Amino acid sequence: NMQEAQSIDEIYKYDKKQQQEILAAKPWTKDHHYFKYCKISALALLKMVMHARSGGNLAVMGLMLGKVDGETMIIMDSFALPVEGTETRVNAQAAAYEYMAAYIENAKQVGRLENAIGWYHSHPGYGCWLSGINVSTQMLNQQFQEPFVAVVIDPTRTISAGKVNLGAFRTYPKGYKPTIPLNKIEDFGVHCKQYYALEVSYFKSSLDRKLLELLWNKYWVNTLSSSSLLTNADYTTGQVFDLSEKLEQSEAQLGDKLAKATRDSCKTTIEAIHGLMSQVIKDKLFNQINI
């Protein structure tokens, strides 16, 4: 069951005509919040993470390759740049651009049919947000290269907490505003009203899943007995709290959001039913032997 292109690998197709039609029509010119979804390949995340950690506490960055399907940015590769940078400020003077177009020209022959879809930057341990000059960077990147998104990575937070600190951001055009609050400015920038985040999800290939499932498990009291359904109790409480506001906004709209709210609630209920199933299978495995 590998020769056929399943629903998992169907995203690995680069249709030149469809992308050309999308880039010619330009539906994003009218709707400012046109893009919402950001799908990212696994290996891009891997290369990004290893490049961020290889530089240590020095900021590193690169250009990513991908396409756009409707309102979803599908990124299929990451790439490193030969730049010199400090903890907070970088230049990318000439070496990056001497290894940017040359890399594209080289990749045109190996089989890489993708083009520039955005850039990722590593912020070492000071949040996932668009800086005061990075917002202008995405300003002039989007003003002429409309299919585009800025990716921000925190290496220190990911390496310490254990969760991927990834953020996909796009900015509003100058003039589109819709005194600063004290809760949306610490997790964002001082120009938080000038940019918004996009939902981020990842995809992989069928052979990737097959290799992962046979790589190494052990994980008997590491996964099969790990206080499941309980470790993310704070996550579930936060989710069940914000579904209240989601449903109340949906009801106000009724007096569409409701499908999104139902999907959001279904995700949590399915996750915790999976936790219950794991607990039940553990009970049937260990407790009920040798009565």
Partner 1 sequence: NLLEQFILLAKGTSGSALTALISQVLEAPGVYVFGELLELANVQELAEGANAAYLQLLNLFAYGTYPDYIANKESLPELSTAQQNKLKHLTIVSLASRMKCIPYSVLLKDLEMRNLRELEDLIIEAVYTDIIQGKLDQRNQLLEVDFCIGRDIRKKDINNIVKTLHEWCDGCEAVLLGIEQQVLRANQYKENHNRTQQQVEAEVTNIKKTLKA
Partner 2 sequence: IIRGNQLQEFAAMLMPHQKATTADGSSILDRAVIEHNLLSASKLYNNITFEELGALLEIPAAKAEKIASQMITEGRMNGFIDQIDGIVHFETREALPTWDKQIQSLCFQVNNLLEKISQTAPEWTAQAMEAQMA
Partner 3 sequence: EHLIAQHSAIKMLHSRVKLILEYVKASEAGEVPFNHEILREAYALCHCLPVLSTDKFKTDFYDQCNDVGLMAYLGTITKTCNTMNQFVNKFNVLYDRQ
Number of residues that bind partner 1 (CB under 8 A): 6
Is the CB of 221 or the CB of 252 nearer to partner 2?
221
Q: How far is the CB of 285 from partner 1 (least distance, A)?
A: 6
Q: What x/- string results for residues 247 through 286 when contact with partner 1 is judged by CB under 8 A? A: ----------------------------------x--xx-
Q: Name the minimum Å distance from CB 207 to partner 1.
A: 21
234 interacts with, out of partner 3, partner 1, partner 2, none, CB within 5 to 8 A per kind: none
Residue 286 contacts partner 2 per CB under 8 A: yes
Decide if residue 220 touches partner 2 (CB under 8 A): yes
Q: Is residue 249 part of the contact set for partner 3 (CB under 8 A)?
A: no
Q: Give the per-residue contact string, 188-217, with partner 3 (x = CB under 8 A; - = no).
A: -------------------------x---x
The piece of 110-118, 138-146, 169-177, 218-226 that touches partner 2 (CB under 8 A) is 218-226
Please report, as residue ranges, which positions from 217 to 236 form the binding site for partner 3 (by CB under 8 A). Answer: 217, 219-220, 223-224, 229
Q: Which residues pair with 168 in a beta bridge?
A: 151, 198
Instruction: Quote the tokens at residue 265.
Output: 């609630």
Instruction: Based on the shown chain and the rule CB under 8 A, indicate whether residue 4 belongs to the binding site for partner 3.
Output: no
SS (H, E, C) the chain: CCCCCCCCHHHHCCCHHHHHHHHHHCHHHCCCCCCCEEEEEHHHHHHHHHHHHHCCCCCCEEEEEEEEECCEEEEEECCCCCCCECCCCECCCCHHHHCCHHHHHHHHHHCCCCEEEEEEEECCCCCCCCCCCHHHHHHHHHHHCCCCCEEEECHHHHHHHCCCCEEEEEECCCCCCCCCCCCCCCCCCCCHHHEEEEEEEEECCHHHHHHHHCCCCCCCCCCCCCCCCCCCHHHHHHHHHHHHHHHHHHHHHHCCHHHHHHHHHHHHHHHHHHHHHHHHHHHHHHHCCCC
The site for partner 3 (CB under 8 A) is made up of: 213, 217, 219-220, 223-224, 229, 247, 254, 258-259, 262, 265-266, 268-269, 272-281, 283, 285-287, 289-291
The site for partner 1 (CB under 8 A) is made up of: 281, 284-285, 288-290
The site for partner 2 (CB under 8 A) is made up of: 220-221, 224-227, 230, 282, 286
